[PDB]
Amino acid sequence: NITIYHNPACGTSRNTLEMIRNSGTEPTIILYLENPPSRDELVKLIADMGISVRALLAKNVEPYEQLGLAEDKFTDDQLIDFMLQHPILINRPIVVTPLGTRLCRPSEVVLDILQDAQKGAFTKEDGEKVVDEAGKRL
Ligand SMILES: [Cs+]
Ligand SMILES: [Cs+]
Ligand SMILES: [Cs+]
Ligand SMILES: [Cs+]
């Protein structure tokens, strides 16, 4: 039972999706920019990811820049509500499986929560080797 909050225009997100698929399951794909999680869902996701709210914030996007989010003047809940109101602020990809939830940055973090091993070697789209045919992480 796998869900990925995906951005098809992001290489990290594409590589993570192809590793989910190479473990033998097709995930539910949520295009978070157009359908972001709700507030309770977002809070849960963050809790399950084990990271700070601030660590999920994408920098180098318009709302982060124009809202001055780089400055330490925001509570966690203010940052969560900015994420709900401006979903491009949610970094990507977020993957949820029966084993847990992770911000998969870098993409191979997803190997921690995939239940089934990669079915064969996996090489990222830019040629970076991740797992060899034997299944060893490179
Ligand atoms: Cs939602
Ligand atoms: Cs695993
Ligand atoms: Cs293998
Ligand atoms: Cs890259």
Curated annotation (Swiss-Prot):
Effect of E125K: 17-fold decrease in catalytic efficiency with arsenate. Mutant is sensitive at high arsenate concentrations
Effect annotated for changing E128A: 3-fold decrease in catalytic efficiency with arsenate. Mutant is relatively resistant to arsenate, but is more sensitive at higher concentrations
Effect caused by changing H6 to P/G/R: Loss of reductase activity. Mutant is sensitive to arsenate
Outcome after substituting D126E: 7-fold decrease in catalytic efficiency with arsenate. Mutant is relatively resistant to arsenate, but is more sensitive at higher concentrations
Database matches in Gene3D superfamilies: Glutaredoxin
Originating gene: arsC
PROSITE patterns on file: ARSC
Subunit structure: Monomer in solution.
GO biological process, one term: response to arsenic-containing substance
Effect of C10 to A/G: Mutant is sensitive to arsenate
Enzyme Commission no: 1.20.4.1
Listed name of the protein: Arsenate reductase
A Pfam family matched in the record: ArsC
Positions annotated as active site in the UniProt record: C10
Catalytic activity entry: [glutaredoxin]-dithiol + arsenate + glutathione + H(+) = glutathionyl-S-S-[glutaredoxin] + arsenite + H2O
Family named by the database record: Belongs to the ArsC family.
Keywords: Arsenical resistance, Oxidoreductase, Plasmid
Modulation of this protein's activity: Inhibited by the thiol reagents iodoacetate (IAA) and N-ethylmaleimide (NEM). Activity is rapidly inactivated by the histidine-modifying reagent diethylpyrocarbonate (DEPC).
Site (Important for activity. Lowers pKa of the active site Cys): H6
Stated role: Involved in resistance to arsenate. Catalyzes the reduction of arsenate [As(V)] to arsenite [As(III)]. The resulting arsenite is then extruded from the cell via the ArsAB transport system.
Keyword Oxidoreductase found: yes
Gene Ontology molecular-function annotations: arsenate reductase (glutaredoxin) activity
Activity vs pH: Optimum pH is 6.3-6.8.
